[PDB]
Amino acid sequence: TVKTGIAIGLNKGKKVTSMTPAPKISYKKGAASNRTKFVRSLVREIAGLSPYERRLIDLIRNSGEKRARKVAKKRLGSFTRAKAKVEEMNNIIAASRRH
């Protein structure tokens, strides 16, 4: 992370003595806690599953994970949210009947 000292290149810029600022507590906003993990797991067993989540579980078992991600993308927004939802359904499947 040391600059070269010339005006152009990969690590261009002037070399100065570096300091590491103290970490800001606001950078841990989306971090899970013991209280929040306990509540979310308990609510999951109470409320059950959404109608579209049941369809994804059927697709994973009968049609494969690749197609379930395609369907999950349409129901959700971005393609990256489909991966998280499909991965979440796999953990549910691994414990519902597989164990």
Partner 1 sequence: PSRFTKTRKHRGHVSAGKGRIGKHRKHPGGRGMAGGQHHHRINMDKYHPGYFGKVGMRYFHKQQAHFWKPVLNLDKLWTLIPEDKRDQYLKSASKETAPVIDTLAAGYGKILGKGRIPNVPVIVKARFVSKLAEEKIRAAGGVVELIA
Partner 2 sequence: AISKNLPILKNHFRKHWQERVKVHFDQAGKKVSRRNARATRAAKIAPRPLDLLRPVVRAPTVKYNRKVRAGRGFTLAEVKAAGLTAAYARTIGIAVDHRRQNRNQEIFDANVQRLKEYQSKIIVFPRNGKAPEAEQVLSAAATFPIAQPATDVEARAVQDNGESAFRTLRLARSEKKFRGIREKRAREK
Partner 3 sequence: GAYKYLEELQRKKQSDVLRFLQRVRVWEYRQKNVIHRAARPTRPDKARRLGYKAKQGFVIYRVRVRRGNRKRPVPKGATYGKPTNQGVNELKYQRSLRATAEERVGRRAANLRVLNSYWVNQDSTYKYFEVILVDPQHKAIRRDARYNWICDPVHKHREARGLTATGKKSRGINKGHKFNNTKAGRRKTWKRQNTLSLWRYRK
Partner RNA sequence: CUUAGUAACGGCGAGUGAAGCGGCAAAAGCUCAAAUUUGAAAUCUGGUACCUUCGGUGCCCGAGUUGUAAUUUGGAGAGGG
Partner RNA sequence: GUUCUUUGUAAAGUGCCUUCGAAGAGUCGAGUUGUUUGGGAAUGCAGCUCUAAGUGGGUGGUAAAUUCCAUCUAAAGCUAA
Partner RNA sequence: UUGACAUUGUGAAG
Chain residues binding partner 2 by CB under 8 A are: 4, 6-10, 12, 14, 16-19, 21-22
Q: Of the ranges 10-18, 27-35, 55-63, 69-77, which one interacts with partner 1 (CB under 8 A)?
A: 10-18
**Angle at the Cα of 83 from the Cα atoms of 82 and 89, rounded to 5 degrees:** 90
Encoded amino acid at 54, one letter: R
Give yes or no for a contact between 89 and 58, defined as CB atoms under 8 angstroms apart.
Answer: no
Residue 5 interaction partner, one of partner 1, RNA, partner 2, none, beta carbon < 5-8 Å per kind: partner 1
**CB nearer partner 2, residue 5 or residue 64:** 5
The rounded distance, in Å, linking the Cα atoms of 60 and 90 is 8
